[PDB]
């Protein structure tokens, strides 16, 4: 119970959390409810092999996550392209959230683009953890669940495109953060003044500082018993970079190995000279 | 508790001073000028590199027999020799961090094996400015441009560190700050191969509380310094993996047995 300074920090966290619920259709709260398999109304269909994938398509309504095409004749590529269009959608969701971050749209246009360019994938993997457990990941807005082993057995290049994420997710999830915490953390990620090419770093840092103050307060009030949670969370920022890097790397291999597979233009630009 | 946190801080600082000959305070005085009028020997080109070798006998722009006669390579090797020397200083310091020596011996080794590079680069910033780096316990000054002038993959082997340095030094941390930060880096529980992570995380938790307090007491003005400092650990690790990739190319191409074992 304290000052007007802390009051503004609480108002900020509320605004961000509010925007978060409004920008992301599938929150961590909903993901855990589905994953903890509590209910009889939210049960996901599980894909763990070829025949379940074959049934899942029939049961699950995979809203063109892999736009028009029969069977690209390779589950591996269908699955991959799918992960791509979903990524694109995720970028759309994140971009919308970014606009709600106080001060973000007031920044220089080119810098707005730079921050999104380097921040969206770090955010994507951060939020993906919410949809994961050590055994698999939720898909189709929680309608389905694809096992970690099914993926890990796809085929040479693809067979391991999600593993690093799972390794991250299991660790990150140990922090037991909730949507109210993630909303501010993701805002911090985007307002990173050390992104390559930023024209005006100061205004960005001023904004990030306020967000960090907001995040720090949020974590002590929400997780009283979690000593140094603030620092452990910030330290996870290093794991995200690594995830992104080896992903981009695997992508260069795919590009050369699959001369016959199209990669989404938005994603290509995001990875250009990244 | 804010009592034991200051005791820990002070203890770390006192050990830092005893383990590292050239502190940041001392280095800054030189780099800026406020040193006894005993300027450092400046290496800005090949001819100055030589006079330095003979005038100040740089510990090790090491005239070994079976390897010299090639500037860029002797410069690269020298950084390796000084790195190995730094590892012993860091190791000594680590043993002074409360709880460290009481950890599983293999974990102690693992923590050092994976933490020294990050510490080496964190501390190298103390001796660098946008124009150059201090060498030979601050007895000399080697230009950023001269280093960048080396060719092959060498010309750019120090540039990444300089970039890091400039951004890191912007935080204006001093030795008492760095002492705790360095300790925090060592007690990283995410190093691969660790057998008992709990003790490490517990100590680091204590170290983080101390650093947090230290920064708030020492830099009241700088908002979220603690947070910004932790975010630099991402920068360090990036430099390390990057350095690793160069050591890897210098092996692809680029053509004494005991020295090689030590270093
Ligand atoms: C829809 C088929 C099931 C596969 C689900 C697996 C991963 C889903 C993800 C997201 O929704 C967001 C990120 C992951 C995908 C991992 C990397 C995509 C980065 C973009 C690219 O492929 O270049
Ligand atoms: C603490 C050690 C790690 C920082 C790297 C140290 C030296 C790097 C150098 C170059 O990149 C080119 C020349 C130097 C190597 C020559 C002498 C270093 C001695 C420094 C000292 O004793 O303080």
Question: Can you spell out the DSSP letters for A85-101?
Answer: HHHHHHHHHHHHHHHTS
| Atom of ligand 2 minimally distant from the CA of B124 | 4
Subunit contact B235:A194, Cβ cutoff 8 A: yes
Tell me B40's DSSP state: P
Q: What kind and span of H or E run contains B109? A: helix B105-124
Residue of A184, A150, A178, A182 whose CA lies nearest to A166 = A150
- Contact of A219 with A226, CB cutoff 8 Å: yes
Among all ligands shown, which has an atom nearest to the Cα of A151?
1
Residue recorded with tokens 């950890």: B103
Tokens standing for residue A245: 């890097």
- Contact of A212 with A200, CB cutoff 8 Å: no
Distance B83 CA to ligand 2 centre (A): 7
* CB nearest to B233's CB, from A212, A213, A235: A235
Kindly provide the b/e burial profile for residues A61-98, where b requires at least 16 CB atoms within 10 angstroms of the residue's own CB: ebeebbeeeeebeebbbbbbbbbbbbbeebbebbeebb
Which method was used? X-ray
User: What CATH code is assigned to A1-274?
Assistant: 1.10.565.10
Tell me A44's DSSP state: P
**Domain B1-263 sits in which CATH superfamily?**
Retinoid X Receptor (1.10.565.10)
Phi, psi of B43 (to 5 degrees): -105, 110
- Contact of B211 with B235, CB cutoff 8 Å: no
Q: How far apart are CA A8 and CA A26, in angstroms?
A: 28
Tokens standing for residue A171: 């660790």
- Contact of B189 with B164, CB cutoff 8 Å: no
Rounded alpha-carbon distances, angstroms, from residue A251 to A158, A246, A268: 10, 8, 10
Closest residue in A to B237 (Cα) is: A238
Tokens standing for residue A217: 């307060």
Tokens standing for residue B11: 């203890």
Contacts of A125 by beta carbon, 8 Å cutoff, 6+ apart: A165, A168, A240, A243, A244
Q: What kind and span of H or E run contains A182? A: helix A179-190
Tokens standing for residue B1: 């508790």
A262: exposed, middle or buried (C-beta count within 10 Å: 0-12, 13-18, 19+)?
Answer: exposed
What are the domain boundaries of chain B? 1-263
């Amino acid at each position: 119970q304290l000052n007007p300074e802390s009051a503004d920090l609480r108002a900020l966290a509320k605004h961000l959390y509010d925007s978060y619920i409004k920008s992301f259709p599938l929150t961590k709260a909903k993901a855990r409810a589905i994953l903890t398999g509590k209910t009889t109304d939210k049960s996901p269909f599980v894909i763990y092999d070829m025949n379940s994938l074959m049934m899942g398509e029939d049961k699950i309504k995979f809203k063109h996550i892999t736009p028009l095409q029969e069977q690209s004749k390779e589950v591996a590529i269908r699955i991959f392209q799918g992960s791509q269009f979903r990524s694109v959608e995720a970028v759309q969701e994140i971009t919308e959230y970014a606009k709600s971050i106080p001060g973000f749209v007031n920044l220089d246009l080119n810098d707005q683009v730079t921050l999104l360019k380097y921040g969206v994938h770090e955010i994507i993997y951060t939020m993906l953890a919410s949809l994961m457990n050590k055994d698999g990941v939720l898909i189709s807005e929680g309608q389905g669940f694809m096992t970690r082993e099914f993926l890990k057995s796809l085929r040479k290049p693809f067979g391991d495109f999600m593993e690093p994420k799972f390794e991250f997710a299991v660790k990150f999830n140990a922090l037991e953060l909730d949507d109210s915490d993630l909303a501010i953390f993701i805002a911090v990620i985007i307002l990173s003044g050390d992104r390559p090419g930023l024209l005006n770093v100061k205004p960005i840092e001023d904004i990030q500082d306020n967000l960090l103050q907001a995040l720090e307060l949020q974590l002590k009030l929400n997780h009283p018993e979690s000593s140094q949670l603030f620092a452990k969370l910030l330290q996870k920022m290093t794991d995200l970079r690594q995830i992104v890097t080896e992903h981009v790397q695997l992508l260069q291999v795919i590009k050369k190995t699959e001369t016959d597979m199209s990669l989404h233009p938005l994603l290509q630009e995001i990875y250009k000279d990244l």
